[PDB]
C-alpha cells in the first residue's frame, strides 16, 4: 500500500503542467520521506528534479518504497479532470499495476475516481549534486518568465551577465539585439548574491518550458557558475521544490 492525501490539490495540477511538455515518461520514487522525480528530456540537454516532502501532505502513509513508471502526458490528462479545489488522493497497492487517483469535491456530492496504467521504464539515472555558484539571483517568477518570453521575439539564445551591478539578460538576432537589466532593491525584491561575475548563454526554448512552473511560486532563483549547468528553482510552499537544470551554450 501507498496512500497520500493533499487538500490543496491544485499543487499537483500545477506540477504536472510544469512537466508534461518537457518529458513523456518519468519514474516516481516513493519512499517514506516523500516523492522524488528526475528525468531528462529527449535531447538530454535539460534535466528536472522534483521533490515533495511527507509533512506537506495532510495524510501520508508508505508501507515500503516504490518506483512508478508513469506516462506524464496521461497523468496530466487525468489531473486536468480534477477541480481547482478538489482534495486529491493517490493510492497504490501490491500490484503497482496502476496508480489510483481520487478527486473529492469539498462540497461532498461529487467524487471522481481514476486509475491509470503504470508502464515499465528503463531508468537512465544521473546524480545532480548540489554545487556552488559564482552567482545566485532571486526574482519574481513572473518577471523572469516575461524576460524569457520577450527575448524569444529577438533570438534563440539569451546571455545572462551577472555582476554585483545587477543582472542582465541579452539576445541578438535578425532584427537587432535586446538587453534587459535588473538591479538590486530596497516578496518582489530582486536580490543578488555574487561571489564572481558570470556571463553565460542558454537556449531560450528550454527556459520557456521551465517558466511553466511559474504558477507554483512567487519567487524563482537562478544559480550559475562558469562551466556548470544553470539551476532554475521554484519553491512549492511548505512541501518541496522543482529544479530545472540546463547546459550552457559554447
Amino acid at each position: 500500500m501507498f496512500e497520500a492525501r493533499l487538500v490543496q490539490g491544485s499543487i499537483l495540477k500545477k506540477v504536472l503542467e510544469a512537466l508534461k511538455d518537457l518529458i513523456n515518461e518519468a519514474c516516481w520514487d516513493i519512499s517514506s520521506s516523500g516523492v522524488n522525480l528526475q528525468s531528462m528530456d529527449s535531447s538530454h540537454v535539460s534535466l528536472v528534479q522534483l521533490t515533495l516532502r511527507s509533512e506537506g501532505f495532510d495524510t501520508y502513509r508508505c508501507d515500503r518504497n516504490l518506483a512508478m513508471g508513469v506516462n506524464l502526458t496521461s497523468m496530466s490528462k487525468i489531473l486536468k479532470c480534477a477541480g481547482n479545489e478538489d482534495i486529491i488522493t493517490l493510492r497504490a497497492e501490491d500490484n503497482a499495476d496502476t496508480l489510483a487517483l481520487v478527486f473529492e469535491a469539498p462540497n461532498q456530492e461529487k467524487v471522481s475516481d481514476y486509475e491509470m496504467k503504470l508502464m515499465d521504464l528503463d531508468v537512465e539515472q544521473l546524480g545532480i549534486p548540489e554545487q556552488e555558484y559564482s552567482c545566485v539571483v532571486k526574482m519574481p517568477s513572473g518577471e523572469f518568465a516575461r524576460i524569457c518570453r520577450d527575448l524569444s521575439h529577438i533570438g534563440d539564445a539569451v546571455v545572462i551577465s551577472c555582476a554585483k551591478d545587477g543582472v542582465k539578460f541579452s539576445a541578438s538576432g535578425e532584427l537587432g539585439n535586446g538587453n534587459i537589466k535588473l538591479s538590486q532593491t530596497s516578496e518582489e525584491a530582486v536580490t543578488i548574491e555574487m561571489n564572481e561575475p558570470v556571463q553565460l548563454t542558454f537556449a531560450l526554448r528550454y527556459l520557456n518550458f521551465f517558466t511553466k512552473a511559474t504558477p507554483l511560486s512567487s519567487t524563482v532563483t537562478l544559480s550559475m557558475s562558469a562551466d556548470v549547468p544553470l539551476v532554475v528553482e521554484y519553491k512549492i510552499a511548505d512541501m518541496g521544490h522543482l529544479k530545472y537544470y540546463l547546459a550552457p551554450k559554447i
Binding site: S43, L126, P229, I250
Partner: peptide, 11 residues
C-alpha cells in the same frame, strides 16, 4: 555559437 548535453557535468 555551440551547445552540449547535461551528461558532461554530473556523476
Amino acid at each position: 555559437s555551440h551547445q552540449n548535453v547535461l551528461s558532461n557535468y554530473f556523476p
